[PDB]
Structures are given as C-alpha cells and as structure tokens.
From a paper:
The dynamics of kinetochore-attached microtubules are regulated by hepatoma-upregulated protein ([name]) and the mitotic kinesin-8 [name], but the underlying mechanism remains elusive. Hepatoma-upregulated protein ([name]) is a spindle assembly factor that localizes to the chromatin-proximal region of K-fibers in a process mediated by Ran-GTP signaling. Through its stabilizing and bundling activities, [name] regulates K-fiber dynamics and spindle morphology, contributing to chromosomal movements and alignment. K-fibers also recruit [name], a member of the kinesin-8 family that walks towards and accumulates at the plus-ends of K-microtubules.
Numbering used by the authors:
A (entry chain B), D (entry chain D): 1 to 426
B (entry chain A), C (entry chain C): 1 to 37, 47 to 437
C-alpha cells in the first residue's frame, strides 16, 4: 500500500545502493535472478514496498541508478545481484562531473536530469501510493553532490507532499579525499537545508572507527562500510515491511524527530556489533542493545554527542521483545544522562518495535539521534570554506561553468545561519 | 432484547478489541469460525444457521494491524465489511486524524454504524476503545464522537482510553494530542474509563510475578475489566446494573465524567493456593492505591462515587458488611455532599480465564469504578508538559500545515485550565 | 567508451612513446604484430579481425628516429600513415621548428589527428611527449598545442616534457628554446608533468644500483609513470580518477599548472627481498627529495596540492593512515589557503614489468603528482642562464635569420618574470 | 634524404680526397670496383649520402675532382680505388697555377670554373635534397687556394641556403713549403671569412707531432696524415649515415658552435690514437677518450688551446656507450678547467652519439673546438704578410695577372679585424 522508490547517484551512491539491494534481497528471500525462494509468507506479504511484480513470479527492484560515467554502472551490472535491476533504469552519461559541483549541477546535470526525471516519473506513476523518495549520494563529489541536489529540487517541485529522505556521506574531519571537498559540501548543504525532509549524515572516519575498535576488523574494505550503512537503511524502514507491536513509518519518525524545519540532520547508529571472538562473552538482551546505542563509539557521525544535547531520539527495535523493558530502559537512560537532553522537551525518545529480526540475529535495533553536536561538523566545513574562498583558490573552475560568487556567499551565509540556530537551541 | 455496539479505533483499540472478543468467544462457547455446538445475543448477531458474528467495528488509518486480524485465527469470526482500513496513518498527528485524513473515511464508518444499528432493537449504547496519544486514536476518535452525538443523540456513549503515563511515554508530541482530544471530546462523551500502561506494568510485575509483561497481558487484563463491566448485560444476576446506571450514578456534574477502573483479584496460580479469597479481602484490595489501574494517589484525593461489580459466588450480606467496614476506615475519604457513594452489582457467572493466560481461575471478582479528585494531579502534570512544549512553539508547524490553527491550541489550554478549576472547586 | 590520444614529437618524444607502447602491449597481452590470443580500447583501436592498432601519432622533422621504428620489432603494430617524417631537422632552432620547417608539415599532422578523433566516441584529451631543449620539440610542439587549442577547445591537453637540467645539459642554446616554448605554451596548456634527466640518473644510480644508466632505462621509468597515471582509465579499481580530475584538483590558478612527477617503489630484485613493501613506507618515500623526478628542493618550498595514485593490493584504510601521518609531519608543509591538499585514487591492477627490465615485480606502487612553489628555483636558474647569454646577443642571428624578432625574446623574458612573480606571490 | 657532394681541389685536396673516399668505401663495405660486399644492412640504409646508384648494383661517389695539371689526377686514377670515380667528374687544365693565387683565381680559374660549375650543378640537380657542400684544399698553393675560393664564392652565389664546409690546410708556423705562402693564405682567409659556414684548420706539423709523439711512427708519410684527416672527416658526419641515440647533423653542429658569423674557425681532434705496443696498456673507456680530446698534443691545429679560451665545443661519440658517463665527464672536464672556458656561455660543450663505431674499433669519438687561440695563427700569418708587403717582394708576379694592391690591403685589414674580434671575445 505504501511504496518507496530508490535513487543512486555517483560512485559512492551506486555502491551503497548495490549493497543495500543485496541486503534487502537477502531479507526477503529473493535470489539474484529475481525469483522468490523464501519460506515465511511474511517475506512476501509486503514485498511490494521495494519490489515490482513483473510477471512469471519475478521481482524487480524499484530503483534508478544515475551516474555521469559508465564505469561504476558497468561494475554494478557485472557484479553480484546486478541482473535483477531493470536495464532501462541505468541512466548514465559519458562526460563525467570531474569532482566539480558546477558541472554536475549546471552543465551535465542539466542534460541528464530530464531523462532521470522521466524515469522517476514513470516509476512513481506505476505505484499505487508512494510513501516517498530516498537517495544515496556524496557531498564531496561532483556527480553525487550536484546531480543529487538538482534531482532533489526537481522532485520536491513535482511532489511537494511526499517524504524526501537522504543518506548522504559528509566530508571526513581529519583526512580528506578530494581537494575541493569544502565547496561541494557547502553548496550541497545549502540546497539540502531547504529541499529535503530528513538527512542521515554518514562519516567514513566513524565507519573506520566502528570496524576497527568494535568489529575488530583487521582490514576493513569499502564493502564493509556499505554493509553497515545498508544495515542502518534496512533498520529504518522495517515497520513498513513487517508487522510489529508498535509501528512507525517515515512520516511518524519525521513528525516525532524534527521540531523546526531547518533542524533535520540526524546521526544514525546500529546495534549489536560484535567481533568474531566476542560473541560468546555477552548475553544478547535489551540492556546491551540500549547501551550500544547511547555511546559515542557506536555513532556513524564524526561528532561527539556529549559535546551538545539531544533534541529527540528514535529507537526502532526488531525482534520478539517485552515492551516494559524497552520503556523502562529508555526512561532510565533519560534519567541517568539528563545533562545531555534538552529540558524543554519531555520524553525526548520515540519508540517502535518490529516483530521480525534480521536473518541470523535474535534481536536488533536502530538508533536515530537529532543532536546539536552536528554544529561542530558544519562549523569546521564552513571554516575550511572561508579559508579557501579568502584567497579565491580553485574559483575559476567553478566560475567557468557559469556559477557566480554570489552563490558561494549565499551558501556560506546559509550554513552560518544554520549553525547559529543549532547553537541557539543548545 | 437489549444490545450493545463496540467500536475499536487505532492500534491500541484494535488490539484491545482482539483480546476482548477472544475472551467473549471463550465465555459464550463460540468457536473462532463463529459456530457453537441465549444471553449472548447482546454481543453476537445470529446469521444464517449456526453462525454468530460480533456487533463490532474495527477502524484504523493503516492496514497492517487489521491485516493481522484478517489473516489471524479469528478471520472467520468477523464480517469482512466491518473491518475498515485506510492507506496512510495519521503519524501521531491530531490534525491528520481530525481533518486531513479523517474526513476521507468517516462516511463509510458512519454507514457501517448505521447498518449495525438497524439490526438493533434495544441498543443500549456505544463502546469506544482508543488511545489519547495516537494520531488517529485521538483525531478520528474525536470526529467520530462528534458525528455520533449529532446523529443519534440521547444514546449513551462510554469510553475506554489509554491515558498517557506520568513518566513512561512512547511518543514525543503526546501532550498536544491528549490536550486536544480532551478539549474536543469533553462535551460529547457521557463517561470515560481511563487506564495507564505504567500502572498495569506495576500490577503485572508485583501481583502476577511476571518479569517482562508485554502488551498482550495488558490487553487481557483490560478485557477482563470490560467483561466484568458488561457481565450484567450478558448474564442474569441477583442485583444487576445496566449501561445507563453507570452514567446516572457516577457523574455528579456533566464536565466531571472521568472515573477510573480497578480490578481484583489479580493473582497467579502460585499465590492463589495460599489465600482464601473471600468477599471482604478483595473488596479491601480494590481500595488500595498500589492496586489501582491509573498511576495516581487516591490518598490525596476525595471520592465522590464508587461502583462495585461483584462476579461469581457472592452473597449480598457479606457485600454490605464489607461496605460498612470500608466506610468506617478513616484512611479513605468521601466528599461531604455525597452521603451515599456506593453502587452495588452482583452477578452469578464467575470470570472465565483464557487458556495460556496469566490469571488463575477464581471464584469471585470485583471491578471497581470510582470518581476521585486525584485525577486533577495527572491533568496538572499533562498541562505542565503541554505548557513547557508550547512555550517554544515546538512541533506547531506539523499541526498547522495540516489545516489546524494556534487558536485551537489556546482554546484547548483554556478549556483544560477551566476543567482543573472545576475539579478544585468540587474538591472543597 | 572513453578514449585517450597520444602524440609523440621529436627524438625524446618518439623514443618515450616506443617504450610506452611496448609497456602497453605487455600489459594488455597484445603481440608486437597487433594480435592478441575489453578496457584496452581506450588506447588501442580494433581493425578487421584480430588486430589492435595504437591511437598514437609520431612526428619528427628528421627521418632516422622514426625509421628505426618502421624497421624495428614493432613495425607491424603502427599504422604506416600515423608515423610522419620530414626531411630536415630543426637543428635546435626554435624558429625553424615553429615557422620555417614546422609549417610545411603541420597540416598533415592536424589531418591525422582529425582522422584519429573521428574514430573516438568518448575522447578524454591529448597526451603529448616532447623535449624543451630541442628545436622541434619546442617550436613544433608549441605550434601543435596552439592549433589544437584553436580547433578543439575544451578538450584537455596534458604534457610530459623533458625539462632542461641545472648542471647536465646536451645543447648550448637550450635556455633560448626553453624560455620561448614556455612563453608560447603557457596559455594553451592545461597541466604539464615535469621530469629532469640527472634526477632520473641519480635514482637509477642509487635506488636501482645501476652503474651506467642509458636512455632506455629513463624511458622505461617514464613509461611506468605514464602507465600509473592512465591505469585508472585502462582498468577498474576501488576509486578511479580520470583526466579531468587531475586538472581540477591540481591547478589552483590558470597560470600555475606545473606539477612534478614522482614514482615509488623503484628498487631492484636484490633489495626487493629485504623489504616488506607496504603502503606506508612507499607513501613516505614518495615525499622525500632524493626520490623525486626533478632535480629540485621541496624542503624550501610549500606544497599546494597533492595527488596520489595507488596500484595493486592497497586498501583505503592504510592510505588514510599514511596521509594522516604525512600531514602530522612538520618537515614538509602545505600552504595556508589549502586546508585539504590530497587527492586519492586506487586501482587493482599491479604494475607489469618488462622482460630484461631493471625494476622488480612489486605488489604495490604509488605515482605522486605534486604542485609546489619549489619550481621557481629551476625557473630562476633558467632565467639567469637566458639573461647571461642574451646580454651578449650570442646566437641571436640564427633565430633572426629564420624569421624571428628580438621583440619575441623580450616578450618571453617579460612573461617568464611575470610567472615567477605569480609563483612568489602565491607562495606567501 | 640528405645528400653531401664532395669537392677536391689541387694536389693536396686530391690526395686527401682519395684517402677519404678509400676510408668511406671501407666503412660502407664497397670494393674498389663499386660493388657492395658488406654484411650489415646499416651500411646500405644511408649509402646515398655519399654514393649514387648507377644501375647494376654499382655505386659511384658523388665527388668532383679539380686540378690545373693532369699529374695528380693521373696518379689518383691509376692508384687503388681510382676506378670508382666517374670519368666525367675529372675536370683538369693544361697550364697549371705555379703556386700563384692570381693564376688560380683570375687567369686559369676563370676559364675552368665554368666547367666545374656545370659539373657541380648537374650533380646537385641529380640529388633530391642536398645537405650542403664540403671542400678539401690548401691555402698555401696556387691552384688550391685560388680555385677553392672562387668555387666557394660561385656556389654561395648559386646555393645560399645550403651549408658550406671546408677542410683546409693552412700555412704552418715553423717550416714553410712555399716562399709565397702568406700571400695566398691571406687572400684565402679573406674569401673564407665571408663565403663559408665552418672551416676546419689543419696543420702539417700538428699531424707530424701526433704521428711522432702519440702514434710512435718512425717514418711518417703523407698517407698517414691524410688517413688521420679522413678519420676526422668521417667522424664529423657519422650521424647522417648511421643511427644513434642523440643525432647531430652539419646544421646542428653549426648552430651550436658558431655564435657570431665571422667566428667559424675550428680546430679538430680525434681519439683514440695509440701505437702497436701501447694498445695493450689501456682499457678503452669514455674517460680515456675524453682525456685524449682535451689535450694540446692531440689537436690538429698548431695552436695551444691553453693560450686562449674555448667558446664552444662539440664532441661526437661513436659506439655503444652510456649517456650518463658522457654527460658526467663533459661536466667534469668543464668544471676542472673553468679557466679555459668562456664565462658568458654556460654549457660550452655539445654532445652527440652514434651507435655504429668505425670498423676495427670498439669506441671512437671526434672533437671540434672553436677557440680564441686561432688568433695566434692569424696574427703570425698577418705579421709575415706585412713583413713581405713592406718591401714589395714578389708583388709583380701577382700584379702582372691583373691584381691591385688594394686587394692585398683589404685582406690584411680583414685579418686585423678578425684577430681584433677574437681578442675582444677573449
Ligand atoms: N494498553 C495498550 N496500549 C497500547 C497498545 N498499543 C498501543 N498503545 C498505546 O498507544 C500509544 C500510541 O498510540 P497508537 O495506538 O500506537 O497509535 P494510533 O492510535 O494507531 O495512531 P497513529 O499514530 O496514527 O498510528 C502508545 O503510547 C501506547 O501507550 C496496546 O496494545 N495496549
Ligand atoms: N629522457 C630522455 N630525454 C631525451 C631522450 N632523447 C632526447 N632527449 C632530450 O632531448 C634533448 C635534445 O632534444 P632532442 O630530443 O635530442 O631533439 P628534438 O627534440 O628532436 O629537436 P631537434 O633538435 O630539432 O632534433 C636532450 O637534451 C635530451 O635531454 C630520451 O630518449 N630520453
Ligand atoms: N562509504 C562509502 N563512501 C564512498 C564510497 N565510494 C566513494 N566514497 C566517498 O565519496 C567521495 C568521492 O565522491 P564520488 O562519489 O567519487 O564523486 P562523484 O563521482 O562525482 O559522485 C570520497 O570522499 C569517498 O570517501 C563507498 O563505496 N562507500
Ligand atoms: N696534409 C697534406 N698536405 C699536403 C699534401 N700535399 C700537399 N700538401 C700541402 O700543400 C702545400 C702545397 O700546395 P699545392 O697543393 O701543391 O699547390 P696547388 O697545386 O696550387 O694546389 C704544401 O704546403 C703542403 O704542406 C698531402 O697529401 N697532405
Ligand atoms: Mg498506528
Ligand atoms: Mg632530433
């Protein structure tokens, strides 16, 4: 009854989308050919939320893959589970954005956005009642940032009453991948603060921290980080696909977590996460899950939650569990750390419980936190942008594409206003 | 002869309805497919030959919870038309439940209530199950009660609601929804029975010796309370009270129509052996604050009226002696202008227990319904939460975007303050 | 899908191209006859059946050097019309290469590039290999760059050039040609990768333990560098970088486009056994002055932008750790206005080794493209030599007799002084 | 592609021409009948630069022989390799110059130069692209000096864009073979400074010194001197005939060596040169070659290079070698002797390498030096000319042929200007 469409932009977006679709197919018992092979009918009752029935009992994911270079598209086509995607959904260009926001937003993005919007319009018209849109992309790149921004703007113009979710990776604090990262990040945030409903900020350094300290992984690989992100993504929308005691869809989480429209930047977390040698040394119960949530070590954003205050918190639990334990433990964790919770919002925590746990686990849970410590990341990105723009470095690359310095100034001012607001409500 | 219609709204109302109808089917010997191998006529309709269908309506703006009913064990029990489902939930938003999403489906529900009413010859009233904190269970419930009062008028309507707990709450915007729903349904509900999840959690942990109570246990206990209330209609006793008697004996003033329910005895099989459960001891247990089903302290309040529903092997003389003993106790107090504050009801059929349940089989039981000024404390804490949240205008835009107005917020605040003032004036 | 076209000009360019195409044929398993027993299409075209022809153009104003190609082992590899030869060499004269002899052959070369580009669908840009000191490699290369910029425009052009060395130089009039060609191709270049002869001599003598390096070893090393640069296009990896990304990440200002190249690890088989070649230490080795491919001092300069290209068994976490360790080091420094100074690209294909070569087979390799202000020192020594020679008007009549004017010398001097001023101003 | 046409004038010119053609034929594997008998195809790839294919796989040299008496031509025709020359190329008179510049330039030169010019014009039109001309002659003779200068003037009129080289033997300081040597030498250099591109000065006593001290030759003969000169001549143009790593033709050497048009007088040298006994006592390496180059004993001009400064230096190496050694040793020899190198010319040395070494030798190299010390030779010739012209000795021999004393004064002034410039740039 409720439908979710998927969009993947850029190399990072495509890779996370591939991992997420593999995880979802594993959950629903669908083999890489599109034929259902599960046992429990619960895997099939709400399968339409992510899959389309295309005759012959074959299910095709409701996804659109977008990129300005064929490389990642070819890699995802040739890789595992690359067959199930519809060949018409692969919309790819030839030039490539070259890690430039202006190229992906103004030059090549303008050319490709018409075809991408046509495909997304056909997909949305094919469904009965879409819940909303979700997009995976990066804010440091040229294809991801600019193209996903233009796409979000176009859909928000077309479908104003639907939910827009994004799972975007923000630039890392310590070591950067691209030289021009701050420009793209600042412009992308400038557009996101207006054109989206909720954003989940992911940091690669946080994922490395998790994989090293918590998962005891000797040699982490990008596949593992995408695995963690996909686990979070599956955890968020679990109540739309399986029955439970207390159900919460995307709109419920939105109405519970964002008090003011510009304050919709969340940090996600997942539990449990244990190494190979450490499974035997813990009894998997609700106390351990809720302890693993409220911990800076387990956060997927490179921001310390104890440097600020939580505005709202959402905890989505999966598995057969007792509601009394959940409620009393949320109350207890609120009581013990009252210094980290905003005083003028009683009951900062919103709860939801789903009966079906992920395959292989008896219990699992997903944490979404709207804290004011994201001001640190925004502040440092703004500071780097100011340092670069002071000397007009790399400015001709963006200016030659038709961009103006006024756009840079507007983006800087908007980020400063947002950090001012986040400091104000602290 | 005289019939009764049940309406279940929202997730909580629907699940309570499943528990209640399972208990009714167990009591009257009706199989889950609707057959049985005639006082049940007040709750089940007879269709065709050897098929009994409940006189119930199930409403929810999202399909999953009622899809569970349509797929579950009691799929054959319910008429497929009287299970109404929407496509989008209200998402913990009173405005969506009232205006934006509520008005699309209310006409079909009203048609279904009317159709259930045509088959009624002696309809006594309506029972509504819902929660104060939810989106649909608040907004659509309020809209439904307004339309029902407009359409039917003098027929009594009774409420069974999930009042938000003082410190244990699930949602964040609960104070808004609670204040708005009381403001809207104050004048349209004849009487409301509130229960609290925290109190039932405590009762299950202490008296039933359960470590991890779930929602199913709470629903089972609530269904026991409801069955105790309606046993007078569904059977024949020595001294019985119907739906109208509750309203005419519990409300001293129209605006103060908020009694609370208390059930006894709630013990497991382990402790049932070491107690000779007489009438006097269960009557005493009904008055103790740790046994009450709403997290609140009757010690700081004053009783205006009490209703007792005796069930099973009970004789009137022991009842009268227990009432006298309660009256002499100085620890509890009745307000001065009510010299007589007790309503007594005695029934013969003992309480049936569901297989696999947590309660043990007992000879006698009591369901207490009393009006106490201590509800003003819970009202005050709710209003304080509302004031704290509304001082910053947090989450207002969600309600405004769906077609509401801040003037409605101010009106609800003023009305709840007036209700608190009325409670205080009654107290003295 | 996407294609890259190579141009080789002059003796140095032709020989470097020979080494490069040998390495490409080895990497893609193409026999010297063009047959093989599909990512190679970016460098090889497919004609008929079982034949691959390189997308290259070889130009020289004297026939002997290309006659060696046409008579050598790879005579069957190249298309006979893409090996263009003149009759008279420019004789280390910029005027002869640019006007007198260049204009007789330029149109044929332009026609050949047009025919080659007609067969490409996703052409990325042009790679030109040439030498600064030679008459042809300066004059004709500048003419070619100007005409290419006029005709194609936005398509990127990259240069691999032989910088004149500080103390070891072959010709006498080299400063004249170097200054003139830099002044001419400043405005028509997107980025130029710079190498020097005695630098590679030192690397071969020290790290490779070779006593008497020849031109073949230098050309093999340059081939390895170019293969490392284009591996992102010719294969698939964890994180790829195309031609445009280099230009957009390494060039902060239009007139500052002279990064220097650096390759690691360059070690023989003797010392390969006694070293565990991981990511970290090769990353450090890429940053030391003794290993860079231009005889220059970076310790007295400031880095502006850094690009690292990893090949083989490399994981991103080790790359991140190595970059962090480099950043925390004080002995090297980054300019203030560039807080983020690194660009990372990772490829899966390990480097291939030619048979009989000097480098050993290694699991991982790094190509470093660094933009630093230290190039101003080599600039300054070049201007010192040019001014000292031009004070006496020595050899000017040779250039004037071919149709050049002393005003061109003055303009080149002024432009080079302006470039030095720009570098110095950016440095602070 | 590039063709060189050879000219021989006078007795000395004809003798060195015969020796040079013998050496070249041996290098290219051509028997004294004109038929190819070598093995390596490299001998035949660029054979057209000196030989014409005259049908029946027979090659004839592209050379013109000139003399005013049949004697030397009869001798060269009768001697070894005399048959390969084309009979029509023998242009001879009957009178003879009698060691008089006037007769060779005005009286008999005028009559015979038209026929010589026709022959060279035919030869040049036969070739497709000529590099230039080279002349072998003497400045102390009458036929050689006059005819060589007149021919040089005529060709420079006819072909102004082509390189003009001369290998001229100058009058020598200690002993003089002719009484009137300075007059002929004076007029010869007067014409040479204006009408040539580069001239290589050869001195007989320099060759005698090399043969005695270096080659340990007890009884040197003109054949050995001409053999050395031929070795130098073949070394100069080796890059035009054989492949190499770094190639330098005549034009490259000119543009690298002559900074001002009047300063094109070089002093050539050759290495290695060892006797029969001394061949065992050294290892043939680049250090020994470059040591033998920079030594006054090894130079073919009777001028000490240490009495002046080197303006430019060209070193043409033959054989398979490493370029690193070549560059490092040129730098080293530049550094050690900074007092003998001009300060306002960085990199006085130009290098070139050819893969094919001369037959019999593993390595060889040729040195061309443009040094100020030639001022000593010019000054000596000028002083002798002035000394004889003060007394008007032997002046009637030159006057009776039509010459005027003004020509003598002009030539004297030209030497004075030349020596003044050479001193100035010192
Ligand atoms: N006693 C009891 N209370 C319940 C049960 N299920 C939900 N609730 C209460 O309902 C409150 C939230 O409202 P819901 O019923 O879940 O939501 P809703 O009424 O369907 O309205 P929507 O937000 O539109 O879904 C929670 O705070 C619970 O206290 C139940 O099974 N038993
Ligand atoms: N690294 C390297 N440098 C070379 C090579 N060949 C020539 N060079 C350089 O080129 C410079 C001289 O220019 P050349 O390439 O020889 O001549 P050109 O570029 O063809 O121009 P012309 O003088 O007209 O022939 C020398 O100083 C060398 O440093 C080579 O194979 N490898
Ligand atoms: N978590 C994660 N991050 C990635 C992945 N691939 C790239 N990234 C990040 O994305 C950034 C590069 O942006 P990119 O998507 O390549 O630019 P684009 O091609 O223009 O969209 C880098 O900072 C990487 O850290 C991936 O597979 N997983
Ligand atoms: N190196 C060398 N010099 C010679 C040879 N024959 C003559 N000479 C020199 O030439 C001079 C004689 O001039 P000559 O050629 O006979 O006069 P011409 O007949 O007018 O050209 C003498 O000074 C000799 O030194 C020779 O075979 N080799
Ligand atoms: Mg609900
Ligand atoms: Mg050349």
């Amino acid at each position: 009854m409720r439908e979710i469409v998927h969009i993947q932009a850029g190399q990072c977006g495509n890779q996370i989308g591939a991992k997420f679709w593999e995880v979802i197919s594993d959950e629903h018992g669908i083999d890489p050919t599109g034929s259902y092979h599960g046992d429990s009918d619960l895997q099939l009752e709400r399968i339409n939320v992510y899959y389309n029935e295309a005759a012959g009992n074959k299910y095709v994911p409701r996804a659109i893959l977008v990129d300005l270079e064929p490389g990642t598209m070819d890699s995802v086509r040739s890789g595992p589970f690359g067959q199930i995607f519809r060949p018409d959904n692969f919309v790819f260009g030839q030039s490539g954005a070259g890690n430039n926001w202006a190229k992906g937003h103004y030059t090549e993005g303008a050319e490709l956005v018409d075809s991408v919007l046509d495909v997304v319009r056909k997909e949305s018209e094919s469904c009965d009642c879409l819940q909303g849109f979700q997009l995976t992309h990066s804010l440091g790149g040229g294809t991801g940032s600019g193209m996903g921004t233009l796409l979000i703007s176009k859909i928000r113009e077309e479908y104003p009453d639907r939910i827009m979710n994004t799972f975007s990776v923000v630039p890392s604090p310590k070591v950067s991948d691209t030289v021009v990262e701050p420009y793209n990040a600042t412009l992308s945030v400038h557009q996101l603060v207006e054109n989206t409903d909720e954003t989940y900020c992911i940091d690669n350094e946080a994922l490395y921290d998790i994989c090293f300290r918590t998962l005891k992984l000797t040699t982490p690989t990008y596949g593992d980080l995408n695995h963690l992100v996909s686990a979070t993504m599956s955890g968020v929308t679990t109540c739309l696909r399986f029955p439970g005691q207390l159900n919460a869809d995307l709109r419920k989480l939105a109405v519970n977590m964002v008090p003011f429209p510009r304050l919709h930047f969340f940090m996600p977390g997942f539990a449990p996460l244990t190494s190979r040698g450490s499974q035997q040394y813990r009894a998997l119960t609700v106390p351990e899950l809720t302890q693993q949530m409220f911990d800076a070590k387990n956060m997927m954003a490179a921001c310390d939650p104890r440097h600020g205050r939580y505005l709202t918190v959402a905890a989505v639990f999966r598995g057969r569990m007792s509601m009394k334990e959940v409620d009393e433990q949320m109350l207890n964790v609120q009581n013990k750390n009252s210094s980290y919770f905003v005083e003028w919002i009683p009951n900062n925590v919103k709860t939801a419980v789903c009966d079906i746990p992920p395959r292989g686990l008896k219990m699992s849970a997903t944490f979404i936190g709207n804290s004011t410590a994201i001001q640190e990341l925004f502040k440092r990105i703004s500071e780097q942008f100011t340092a670069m723009f002071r000397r007009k470095a790399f400015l001709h690359w963006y200016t030659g594409e038709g961009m103006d310095e006024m756009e840079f100034t507007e983006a800087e001012s908007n980020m400063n206003d947002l950090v001012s607001e986040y400091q104000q409500y602290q | 002869m005289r019939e009764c219609i049940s309406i279940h709204v929202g997730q909580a109302g629907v699940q309570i309805g499943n528990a209640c109808w399972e208990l009714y089917c167990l009591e009257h010997g009706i199989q889950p497919d609707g057959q049985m191998p005639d006082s049940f006529n007040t709750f089940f309709s007879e269709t065709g030959a050897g098929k009994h269908v409940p006189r119930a309506v199930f409403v929810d703006l999202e399909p999953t919870v009622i899809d569970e009913v349509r797929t579950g064990t009691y799929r054959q029990l319910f008429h497929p038309e009287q299970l109404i489902t929407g496509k989008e939930d209200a998402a913990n938003n009173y405005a969506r439940g009232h205006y934006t999403i509520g008005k699309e489906i209310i006409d079909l529900v009203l048609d279904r209530i009317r159709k259930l009413a045509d088959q009624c010859t002696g309809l006594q009233g309506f029972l509504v199950f819902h929660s104060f904190g939810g989106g649909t269970g608040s907004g659509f419930t309020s809209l439904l009660m307004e339309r029902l009062s407009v359409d039917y008028g003098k027929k009594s309507k009774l409420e069974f609601s999930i009042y938000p707990a003082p410190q244990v709450s699930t949602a964040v915007v609960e104070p808004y929804n609670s204040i708005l729903t009381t403001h809207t349904t104050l004048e349209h509900s004849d009487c409301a029975f509130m229960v609290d999840n925290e109190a039932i959690y405590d009762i299950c942990r202490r008296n039933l010796d359960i470590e991890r109570p779930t929602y199913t246990n709470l629903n089972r206990l609530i269904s026991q309370i409801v069955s105790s209330i309606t046993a007078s209609l569904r059977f024949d006793g020595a001294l019985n009270v119907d739906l109208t008697e509750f309203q005419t004996n519990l409300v001293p003033y129209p605006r103060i129509h908020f009694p609370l329910a208390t059930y006894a005895p709630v013990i497991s099989a382990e402790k049932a052996y070491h107690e000779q459960l007489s009438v006097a001891e269960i009557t005493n247990a009904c008055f103790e604050p740790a046994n009450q089903m709403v997290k609140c302290d009757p010690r700081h309040g004053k009783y205006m009226a009490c209703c007792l529903l005796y069930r099973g092997d009970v004789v009137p003389k022991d009842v009268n002696a227990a009432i006298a003993t309660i009256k002499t106790k100085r620890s509890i107090q009745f307000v001065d202008w009510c010299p007589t504050g007790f309503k007594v009801g005695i029934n013969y059929q003992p309480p049936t227990v569901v297989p696999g349940g947590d309660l043990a089989k007992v000879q006698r039981a009591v369901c207490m319904l009393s009006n106490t000024t201590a509800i003003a404390e819970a009202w005050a804490r709710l209003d304080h939460k509302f004031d704290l949240m509304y001082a910053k205008r947090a989450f207002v835009h969600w309600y405004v975007g769906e077609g509401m107005e801040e003037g409605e917020f101010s009106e609800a605040r003023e009305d709840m303050a007036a209700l608190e003032k009325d409670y205080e004036e009654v107290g003295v």
